[PDB]
Amino acid sequence: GEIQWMRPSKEVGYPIINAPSKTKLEPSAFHYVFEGVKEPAVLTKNDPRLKTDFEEAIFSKYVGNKITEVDEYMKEAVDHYAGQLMSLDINTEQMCLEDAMYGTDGLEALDLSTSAGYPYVAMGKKKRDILNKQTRDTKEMQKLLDTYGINLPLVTYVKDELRSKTKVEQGKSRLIEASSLNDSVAMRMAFGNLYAAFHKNPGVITGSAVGCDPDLFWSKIPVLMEEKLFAFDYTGYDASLSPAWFEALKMVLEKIGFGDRVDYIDYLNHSHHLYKNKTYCVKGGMPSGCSGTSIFNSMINNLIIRTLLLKTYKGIDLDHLKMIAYGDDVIASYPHEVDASLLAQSGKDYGLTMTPADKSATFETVTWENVTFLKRFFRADEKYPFLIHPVMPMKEIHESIRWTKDPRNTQDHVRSLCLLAWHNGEEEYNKFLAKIRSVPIGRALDLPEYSTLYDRWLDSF
Numbered sequence: 001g002e003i004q005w006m007r008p009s010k011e012v013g014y015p016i017i018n019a020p021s022k023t024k025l026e027p028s029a030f031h032y033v034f035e036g037v038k039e040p041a042v043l044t045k046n047d048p049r050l051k052t053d054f055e056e057a058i059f060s061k062y063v064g065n066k067i068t069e070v071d072e073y074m075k076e077a078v079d080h081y082a083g084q085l086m087s088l089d090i091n092t093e094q095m096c097l098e099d100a101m102y103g104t105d106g107l108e109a110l111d112l113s114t115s116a117g118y119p120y121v122a123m124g125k126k127k128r129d130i131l132n133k134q135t136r137d138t139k140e141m142q143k144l145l146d147t148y149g150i151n152l153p154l155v156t157y158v159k160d161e162l163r164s165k166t167k168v169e170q171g172k173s174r175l176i177e178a179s180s181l182n183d184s185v186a187m188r189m190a191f192g193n194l195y196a197a198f199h200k201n202p203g204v205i206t207g208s209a210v211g212c213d214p215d216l217f218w219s220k221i222p223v224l225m226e227e228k229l230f231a232f233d234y235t236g237y238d239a240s241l242s243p244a245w246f247e248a249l250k251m252v253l254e255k256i257g258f259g260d261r262v263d264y265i266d267y268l269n270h271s272h273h274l275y276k277n278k279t280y281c282v283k284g285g286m287p288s289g290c291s292g293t294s295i296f297n298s299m300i301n302n303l304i305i306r307t308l309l310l311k312t313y314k315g316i317d318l319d320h321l322k323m324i325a326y327g328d329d330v331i332a333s334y335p336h337e338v339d340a341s342l343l344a345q346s347g348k349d350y351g352l353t354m355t356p357a358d359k360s361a362t363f364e365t366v367t368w369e370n371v372t373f374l375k376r377f378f379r380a381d382e383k384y385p386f387l388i389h390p391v392m393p394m395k396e397i398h399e400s401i402r403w404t405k406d407p408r409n410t411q412d413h414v415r416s417l418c419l420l421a422w423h424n425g426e427e428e429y430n431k432f433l434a435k436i437r438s439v440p441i442g443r444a445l446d447l448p449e450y451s452t453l454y455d456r457w458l459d460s461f
Ligand SMILES: O=c1ccn([C@@H]2O[C@H](COP(=O)(O)OP(=O)(O)OP(=O)(O)O)[C@@H](O)[C@H]2O)c(=O)[nH]1
Pocket: 159, 172, 173, 174, 175, 176, 177, 233, 234, 235, 236, 237, 238, 239, 288, 289, 328
């Protein structure tokens, strides 16, 4: 990923974009009842907490484009992955505007809470308008697709969320590159069934985990993996992607019946962005707020791991590479041990910065005891060991519960945390509930007891 040029949006006929300057995150009723060290992320250059320029920091994620062409290894990776996806009979048909907007089996309806994007954000019009849950009115939308047409600019927003102190002092705030409602609808029509196929098949055939339900899926993973597990973290995955990785992605799409509309991939790759008063053009880099970002990032991860393996171990048998990705997160396996540190080295050559799994200091062996996927561990249940517990650390839950963005959603926010929390065991869960109930707001909440959660879990399989 690399910014080719940036300049004043007025110079090119674009309206300044208004983004709230104040966070919506305030201490919650549980702020002092639990521990935590995270604060809201910097949303402006004027934040007293800053210890370096904001703009330089938020955009430093674009480390550049390391590779230019798709080499021999990448091409092989493409053939293999595309070969696997082939076995899913993915329906190559387009998706009718109705299903793309209000969803169908395998695909959820569009989310009304996220930015409608340009030009709407600058016109003040929102999603509530165009979309009618019970109506299913294509008309208004359909009309808009002719008036403004696809392939429109991406509105860049600073993600309003909790970050470590360092990420606050270093302006390391994440940005949200939002796509126009028009594009989201288009792509969902173009790829709609690809998404559904992926959502309906989390595992090692799609090599994807998007759309999965951790409570059920965790018990299926161990069986799918090969003997030896390997993993690693990516630093700035999305922004590090070079155009070549997008071409490889198009080759996969073409090979499975979507060559028809691989142009859509070109806009993710070479893209136009609006941020505040400035406008910029980026070469490479997966935008964080487009339709499919998650799935396309996972597909690219499947090509990356394959590529690094072929480049480092001539003779490797990709048929026994069992991996599952969720964007940049990944959990992989092979019948034989491999040198992650070595693989990370080849990774640099492809423009990927890979480091020991879970901020380790060195690349150590990956086990079912220390491996994490989506910040969650895998823990077999005491009573019935064949059922696996996705275990989110309590630290994560503690940090989250200490803040709020809307007191109206306190019931839902805490309930959600409870559904992640109990997998840590009855003792821990009850200590968690106790503290929640040690202040008025908590005592008024309708929270599930351990037993109720555990019994429900057992019956869900
Ligand atoms: O809206 C956004 C923007 C960015 N991101 C994602 O955040 C990642 C970079 O944002 P982080 O600051 O969390 O990235 P990191 O993974 O590079 O941090 P390290 O562990 O290496 O210290 C990028 O790889 C992108 O995918 C989102 O998930 N959503």
